[PDB]
Amino acid sequence: QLLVVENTVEVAQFINNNPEFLQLAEPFWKELSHLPSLYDYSAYRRLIDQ
Amino acid sequence: EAKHCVRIETKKRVAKKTKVEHRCTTNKLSEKHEGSFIQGAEKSISL
Numbered sequence: 001q002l003l004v005v006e007n008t009v010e011v012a013q014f015i016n017n018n019p020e021f022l023q024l025a026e027p028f029w030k031e032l033s034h035l036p037s038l039y040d041y042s043a044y045r046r047l048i049d050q
Numbered sequence: 051e052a053k054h055c056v057r058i059e060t061k062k063r064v065a066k067k068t069k070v071e072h073r074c075t076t077n078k079l080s081e082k083h084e085g086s087f088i089q090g091a092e093k094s095i096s097l
Contacts, residue, residue: 052077 016022024032031050036043055074062068 031047034043035047053074053076055072057070057072059070060068
């Protein structure tokens with residue numbers, strides 16, 4: 001039996017800003033703009049699927 | 051190695067009768083065994 005488990009990291013980390021300074025992707029923002037403003041779970045489920 | 055062997059002879063005269071018998075048996079057994087087992091493990095951990 002062999003097990004080899006190996007990692008390289010080359011970007012030590014990224015740290016994304018907090019949500020107040022993040023910019024949303026235009027398609028995602030456009031999906032949020034069509035969310036039904038009520039608990040139509042089908043819609044938010046499709047969003048979580050995407 | 052095991053052997054058991056017997057010889058018997060008789061003659062009688064009075065009339066004459068004789069009987070002679072020889073019986074022999076040999077038994078041998080040999081058993082040979084051999085076995086080999088080897089085991090090894092490596093761990094290497096590097097950072």
